[PDB]
Each structure stands twice: as structure tokens, then as C-alpha cells.
Design a protein around this ligand. Structure first.
Ligand SMILES: CCCc1c(C(=O)Nc2cc(S(=O)(=O)N(C)C)ccc2C)cnn1-c1ccccc1
Lengths: 339, 335
């Protein structure tokens, strides 16, 4: 029910120069609706089908409290460009994991860790309920509303989100042949499932304060659960994670299962056991960047890029090398007729 | 040569006015990439802003390393540097390195999820990958982290091998040879795993934890015999392996059903455990799979580039002024 507005946004809001952080696709400004004096962030994209879907999706999703509210969408010309200006709920609360590092420390708990997840869980559950995959659930798209203690957590940036198909995944049999059969292509199976993979990783970090990746040298997971940090954690929690990180998209845990699991379903009453995460995240700001960077890297391999090209059949393909060699086929053909 | 500023990928980019239409693209992982257009050359280019290049010494070193690699990489099936620039006017301002490159269409990681590559596709792509490695290998350089998401391909099935950073954290390593869990042949194992995936649709060895990864590998290529057992380093490695139900390698003809016999043959030679018995890139290109594309008078080597001060240990500013030298001293390729 999104009514993209046609007039100049400045008729309705005052656009300030106060910068609220640089966006992927431009600069996010503070603005103020003139009628209410309410404050809002203003992000902006270039107008084009992708962007107009991206915003439709986000508009729909906005109904979820753990998703950042699109308030209003204008279509104007900025800097010689057709633009979608997007007025959004302002979020002054920083990234999720930064909050944890910013602590007394009141030790970060397990009960605290469960809510955070349930929140992220609700946001997906909503998204998936209406057949939409956000495909970039990661720590920099998970902002709190504010510095205040009642602050709510929210999922943001719909730049990789897309509508997807509600299809049952089959549950693979116990007995299989030695041979590798051909894949039945179904790219869409990497959609929702991507979101479930990210929940697994963010949960893993949340609990210990490092990621479940390897290192290259030889504080890195390797999909084990190192003592000491993990000594205090339930085996039912670890199995959640293994089931979340299942490398087969058709076999991986589905958000419904996630949100039924007791550690979630009954989070209000989860063991209070304290956690290392904050003191670990404090250890090395430089390392935590590499966490963020590898997670973004990993996600690329776990979602399809439906934007990328298809490879022409070879006899329809032409390029330097492809002729260099064909040009040699005919040089031999000719040489043999010529003598 | 003047620049313009522009807010993109969460930082203030300033690039030469020759590069227009900066659109972001790709993961945006280890530095951020933008699709552009280069009016000087006339064609379409990937422009990459290095991320946090002089934060640590560790970084500062790698940036310098990466750069000299890239400056010495002149091959059709390898990522090559069209341009490198900096808005800085002197070492005192030196803050950001930018790199320009050809722009491709897709990566093979993504191609495999979307498309049923024919045998001819597989011939041509693995050809181009191996053609590339021979060069890389002749330069005394191991790629290490070779994988499908480093194989850039455009729509006419051109292939270029990307990403020499290793030559931090890595999410999975399905394509990593068991030794490095090492010769150049480490790279051939990756080409092994990749070819497998192109032929099949599926990751060959989609291991979960590390234990798992090893079992999955060994489940294809057999457990080692005592001869090659003795060559393993860690005692607890030797044990683990000997704690398994022991078994021979299997006929790849029985695994890769309906593949091209020649492909299977080659795949057999690429995925051998004994690294000292594994086929080289040079050798691979001669294999009969690639009849259609093997031309030895156009499978060029590289000339080597020295250690210089890459086995010298230095302060940040020391790597920083060395990198500057390489940026200013870069010279473009012929138009
Ligand atoms: C990261 C891949 C982006 C991409 C490139 C690219 O990454 N270029 C590139 C490489 C290196 S690198 O390989 O040396 N490296 C990672 C260190 C350094 C600098 C640039 C500019 C080319 N095409 N696409 C591309 C791929 C798929 C679709 C569309 C475009």
C-alpha cells in the first residue's frame, strides 16, 4: 500500500546538513517533518526497478517491530539523477555487537543472548512468513534504536532482499549411492536458507565472542566449540547451531523450527549463565573488523547473485583466446589444402 | 590529474574524472568495488578501494605485497592492473590506495548454482584456469585460496583468476588440499575440486568441521599407504588417519557417472593424495581433454620478481613509503 510521493520532498520535510553516517549508495541525512517536528534518517537510492522492488519489500516488512520503519518515499531529482528518497525511522543505538563491548561490564549473559536472537528470529520469521528473504543479515544491519536500556533491535538495509518461493525441502534419505548424480537446479533454495545460515553465525558469535570460521595460520571456531568459552554452554544450544550451519540448504534448519526450539520458544526462562563475549570482543578491534569482512565475504558464496550474467554456449561465444585458437584450426585446415 | 569526491560504499571515494558512473558491486568484502567507465581507455572497469591498508604492520605489509604481485601479473587468464591511483599528493597525505581492473560478468561460484555447464564449458574453463596457473606457477607463486568465487567469468566464457591476498579468517575451505590443513600442486588440488563441481553441480567435499573435511576427502581418494603415511608431520595426524577403516581410492568413473572419460581421467590426476605424484599445470594443458584449446606456442610463462624487502621486517611508515613508490611508479598497459 506504498504511495511513492511525486512532489519535492522539501515541501514536507526540512532536510538538514547533519550527516547520520555514510550509506552504501549515498549519504544518510537527518531531516525533520515540518508538521510534527519529528526527526528521521533519510537514505537515498537511484531510481530503477531493483530499487523500487527493494523499497516495496521493505515497506511490507516495516510492519514488523524488529524491522526498521520506512515512513515515506519520494521520487525526486537529486544531483541530475532520478532518485528514490526514503524517509526512515532514526536509529541512534549503534550496532548490536558494539553495545556488548560497551559494558560496565555487567557480564553479558545467556538469557540476554537468547532475546537478541529471538528478536532477529522474529524479524526473519515475519520476512519469511510473507515469502521474503533478506539476504544480508549480518552485524552491521542489526542496529538498536537507542543507547537507552529498553532499546529494541532492528534489521536494516534491504539491498539484497528479494521475494522468494514457498517450497517444501525434501529431507534427504539415509541410503544413497556412491555416485554423484546431477544437481536439479533450484537457485531459490539459497534464499530463505541464507537468512538461517546468518542466524547460526550471529548466534555463534553472540555466545563466545568470535566467529565459527577457520584461520589460515593453523579464538577461531572451526565449527567446534572451544573450551574455555564454551565449557558452560548447553549441548541443546550447540545442536541448534550445528543445525543452523548445516552446509546443505535443503537440509538446514527452517525459521519455524528455529522459533519453536525451546532455547527460543521459552527464552524468558533461559539459564542466566554468564558469557565471555564482551571481554573477548574488547580484546582486538582490528580482529573484529576481519570478522565483519569475512562474514560479508562468506555470504556472497551463500546467496545467489541473480544480477550476474549467464555463459553463452561456446559456439555462440567469441573472445580473443577463443578466436586465437579457432584462427589456428583454420590455419591448419588451409595449410593442408595448400601444401 | 584532478579528482572528484563521491559518497560510495560507506567511505568518501575520490577518483580521477576519467572514471565515471561509479556504481557499487559485489560482496564489498576486503575493500569495496565499484563498476565504472574509463573514458581514457574507453571500456568498462572495476575500481577497488583498499580497506584499512595501513592500519597494522601486518596490513601495511600485505598491501605492499598484494600490489607488487598485481603489478607483475600480466596474463590473459589472470587479474591484471589497468590502473592504480591515489588522491594523495605526497607521502604525508598518503591514506588510500585504489586499484582498477577489467570488469567481468559473474563468478563461477554463482554460475554453478544457476546453470548446467556443458562438457565444452568445462573444457574451456578448466583450460583457462590451468593456462593461468602455469604463468602464476612459473613466477614462483602459489595462489593457495583458489576457489570458484575467485574465478571471474564474463558472458563469452572468458575466465580470469582473481585474488592473490594469500600467496585472518576463512569461512570454509573445501577446495584446500589436505597437506595445508606444500608444493605448488596445492593449487592443482583446488582446480581438481572445482572441475568436479562444474561437472556435477555439487561441492565435491562439502565438509562441516575440519575432522569432517578430512574424512570426506579420504572417502574419495583412499587412505594413504604406509609409504606416504611416514611423510605426515604431526603424530596425532598419523594416528587419526590410522584410526580409520582403511581403504583404497575408488574409480572416479564410478563416482562421476556420465562424465567425459577424458575429464574423469584428468580429474584422477588432479585429485591424487601424494602431492609429489599430482599433475602440474604445465602437464595438465597437454592432457587430451583440452585438444581443442591446447596450443603450446601460446601458453606463456612469466619472468620472476624478487623478494626485495618482503623478507625484511619493518615499521608501518616503512611499508607505507614503499607502497607509495609502487603507486607513483606504476605504468599502464598499451591502449
Ligand atoms: C570481487 C569481484 C568483483 C569483480 C572484479 C574485481 O574484483 N576486480 C578486481 C580484482 C582485484 S584482485 O583479484 O586482485 N583481489 C580481490 C585482491 C583487485 C581489484 C579489482 C578491481 C572484476 N569483475 N568483478 C565482477 C564479478 C562478478 C560480477 C561483476 C563483476
Amino acid at each position: 500500500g506504498l504511495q511513492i510521493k511525486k512532489n519535492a520532498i522539501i515541501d514536507d520535510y526540512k532536510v538538514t546538513s547533519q550527516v547520520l553516517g555514510l550509506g552504501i549508495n549515498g549519504k544518510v541525512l537527518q531531516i525533520f517533518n515540518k508538521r510534527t517536528q519529528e526527526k528521521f534518517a533519510l537514505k537515498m537510492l537511484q531510481d530503477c526497478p531493483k530499487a523500487r522492488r527493494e523499497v516495496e519489500l521493505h515497506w511490507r516488512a516495516s510492519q514488523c517491530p524488529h524491522i526498521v520503519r520506512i515512513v515515506d518515499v519520494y521520487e525526486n531529482l537529486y544531483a541530475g539523477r532520478k532518485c528514490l528518497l526514503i524517509v526512515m525511522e532514526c536509529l541512534d543505538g549503534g550496532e548490536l555487537f558494539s553495545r556488548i563491548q560497551d559494558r560496565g561490564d555487567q557480564a553479558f549473559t545467556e538469557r540476554e543472548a537468547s532475546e537478541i536472537m529471538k528478536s532477529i528470529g522474529e524479524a526473519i520469521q515475519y520476512l519469511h512468513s510473507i515469502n521474503i528473504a533478506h539476504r544480508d543479515v549480518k552485524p552491521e544491519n542489526l542496529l538498536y534504536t537507542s543507547k537507552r536500556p529498553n532499546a529494541i533491535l532492528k534489521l536494516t538495509d534491504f539491498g539484497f532482499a528479494k521475494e522468494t518461493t514457498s517450497h517444501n525441502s525434501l529431507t534427504t534419505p539415509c541410503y544413497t549411492p556412491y555416485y554423484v548424480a546431477p544437481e536439479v537446479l533450484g537457485p531459490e533454495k539459497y534464499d530463505k536458507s541464507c537468512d538461517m545460515w546468518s542466524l547460526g553465525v550471529i548466534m555463534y558469535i553472540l555466545l563466545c565472542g568470535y566467529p565459527p570460521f577457520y584461520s589460515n595460520h593453523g579464538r577461531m571456531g572451526q565449527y567446534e566449540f572451544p573450551n574455555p568459552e564454551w565449557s558452560e554452554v548447553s549441548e541443546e544450544v550447540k545442536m541448534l547451531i550445528r543445525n543452523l550451519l548445516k552446509t546443505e540448504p535443503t537440509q538446514r534448519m527452517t525459521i519455524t523450527e528455529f522459533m519453536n526450539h525451546p532455547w527460543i520458544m521459552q527464552s524468558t526462562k533461559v539459564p542466566q549463565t554468564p558469557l565471555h563475549t564482551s571481554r573477548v570482543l574488547k580484546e582486538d578491534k582490528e580482529r573484529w573488523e576481519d570478522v565483519k569482512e569475512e562474514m560479508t565475504s562468506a555470504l556472497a558464496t551463500m546467496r545467489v547473485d541473480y544480477e550476474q550474467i549467464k555463459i553463452k554456449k561456446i559456439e555462440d561465444a567469441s573472445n580473443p583466446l577463443l578466436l586465437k585458437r579457432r584462427k589456428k584450426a583454420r590455419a591448419l585446415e588451409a595449410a593442408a589444402l595448400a601444401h | 590529474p584532478t579528482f572528484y569526491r563521491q559518497e560510495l560504499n560507506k567511505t568518501i571515494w575520490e577518483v580521477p574524472e576519467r572514471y565515471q558512473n561509479l556504481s557499487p558491486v559485489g560482496s564489498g568484502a576486503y575493500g569495496s568495488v565499484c563498476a565504472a567507465f574509463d573514458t581514457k581507455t574507453g571500456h568498462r572497469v572495476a575500481v577497488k578501494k583498499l580497506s584499512r591498508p595501513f592500519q597494522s604492520i601486518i596490513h601495511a605489509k600485505r598491501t605492499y605485497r598484494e600490489l607488487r604481485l598485481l603489478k607483475h601479473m600480466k596474463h590473459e587468464n589472470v587479474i591484471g592492473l589497468l590502473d592504480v591511483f591515489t588522491p594523495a599528493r605526497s607521502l604525508e597525505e598518503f591514506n588510500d590506495v585504489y586499484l582498477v581492473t577489467h570488469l567481468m560478468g559473474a563468478d563461477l561460484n554463482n554460475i554453478v548454482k544457476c546453470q548446467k555447464l556443458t562438457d565444452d564449458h568445462v573444457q574451456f574453463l578448466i583450460y583457462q584456469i590451468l593456462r593461468g596457473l602455469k604463468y602464476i606457477h612459473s613466477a614462483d607463486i602459489i595462489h593457495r585460496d583458489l576457489k570458484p568465487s575467485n574465478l571471474a567469468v564474463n558472458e563469452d566464457c572468458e575466465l580470469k583468476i582473481l585474488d592473490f591476498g594469500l600467496a585472518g579468517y576463512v569461512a570454509t575451505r573445501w577446495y584446500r588440499a589436505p597437506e595445508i590443513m606444500y608444493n605448488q600442486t596445492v593449487d592443482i588440488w583446488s582446480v581438481g575440486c572445482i572441475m568436479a563441481e562444474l561437472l556435477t553441480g555439487r561441492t565435491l567435499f562439502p565438509g562441516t568441521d575440519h575432522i569432517d573435511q578430512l574424512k570426506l576427502i579420504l572417502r574419495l581418494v583412499g587412505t594413504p599407504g604406509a609409504e606416504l603415511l611416514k611423510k605426515i608431520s604431526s603424530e596425532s595426524a598419523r594416528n587419526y588417519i590410522q584410526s580409520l577403516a582403511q581403504m583404497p581410492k575408488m574409480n572416479f568413473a564410478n563416482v562421476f557417472i556420465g562424465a567425459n572419460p577424458l575429464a574423469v581421467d584428468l580429474l584422477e590426476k588432479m585429485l591424487v593424495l601424494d602431492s609429489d605424484k599430482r599433475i602440474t599445470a604445465a602437464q595438465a594443458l597437454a592432457h587430451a581433454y583440452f585438444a581443442q584449446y591446447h596450443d603450446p606456442d601460446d601458453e606463456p610463462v612469466a619472468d620472476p620478481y624478487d623478494q626485495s624487502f618482503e623478507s625484511r621486517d619493518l615499521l608501518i611508515d616503512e611499508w607505507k613509503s614503499l607502497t607509495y613508490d609502487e603507486v607513483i611508479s606504476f605504468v599502464p598497459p598499451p591502449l
